[PDB]
Amino acid sequence: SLPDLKIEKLDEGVYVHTSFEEVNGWGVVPKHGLVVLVNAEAYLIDTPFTAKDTEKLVTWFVERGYKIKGSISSHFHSASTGGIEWLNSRSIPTYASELTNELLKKDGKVQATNSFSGVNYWLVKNKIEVFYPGPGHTPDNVVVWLPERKILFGGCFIKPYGLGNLGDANIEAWPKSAKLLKSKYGKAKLVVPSHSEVGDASLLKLTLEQAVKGLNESK
Ligand SMILES: [Zn+2]
């Protein structure tokens, strides 16, 4: 029995949702995503691994007066797209970049209903921006920046303590990508990694350092 889905308030209009999967090392590993409340509507930033937890997360907010306006998945792995099938099935708009949908399709997974490309994309005009620093953890990974609170959701592109699974990683490009991220969001007040506790802009530096170390230690 895996731990129960958790939903904790991180900042005004921002919640961190946490779900868990069983791996082959850390046994049970926590996966953090967010929920951004704009007006009386909620935007899911990454989905839980399963339909069960995505449903629990959706209903938690629906029962509090919030309509689910949509979800955005930061990379193709289930940790971020596990709930797209369920959300699609409820006609809740789901978003992913073209690269992500291509990896999903290729992996025989259901794709986001709405796609996008380019370095940056505003999911919600001046409130939720999606940024692509380039390949790192996976070919498609993106981050989501909330300008108002200065919060950066890094998903698993932010690896401040070690890079983890390199299976779909691009070790030679990760450094460049992390440099661009660090220059782009040095102003973040909070950086939310997928598997670790929340931190400040230092996580961008630390991620860069691990990426560099990883490239060096590869050749
Ligand atoms: Zn991943």
- In angstroms, this model's resolution equals 2.0
Distance (angstroms) between ligand 1 centre and the Cα of 125 equals 27
Residues with beta carbon < 5 A to ion ligand 1?
77, 156
User: Residues 43, 209: contact at Cβ < 8 Å?
Assistant: no
- In the reported structure, the alpha carbon of residue 119 is separated from the centroid of ligand 1 by a whole-number distance in angstroms of 20
For residue 217 the two structure tokens come to 């230690």
Instruction: List the strands of the sheet with 151-155, edge to edge.
Output: 120-124, 128-131, 143-146, 151-155, 190-193
Could you tell me the distance, in angstroms and rounded to a whole number, from the CA of residue 155 to the centre of ligand 1?
Answer: 8
Residue 44 CA to residue 70 CA, distance in Å, equals 6
List the domains of the chain with CATH numbers: 1-219 (3.60.15.10)
Method underlying the structure: X-ray
CA–CA dist 74, 152 (Å, integer): 12
Written as six digits, the tokens of 79 are 């940790």
Q: Are 121 and 114 in contact (CB under 8 A)?
A: no
As given in the structure block, the two tokens for residue 129 are 């921006």
CA distance 52 to 57: 9
- Distance, CA 64 to ligand 1 centroid (Å)? 31
Token pair for 40: 């009386």
Give me ligand 1 centre to Cα 39, in Å.
Answer: 31
DSSP assigned state of 85: H
**Ligand 1: centre distance to CA 42 (Å):** 24
List the one residue out of 84, 77, 76 whose CA is nearest residue 58: 84
How many angstroms separate the CA atoms of 123 and 121, rounded?
Answer: 6
CA distance 70 to 42: 7
Quick check: helix, strand or coil at residue 151? strand
How far is 42 from 151, CA to CA, in rounded Å? 16
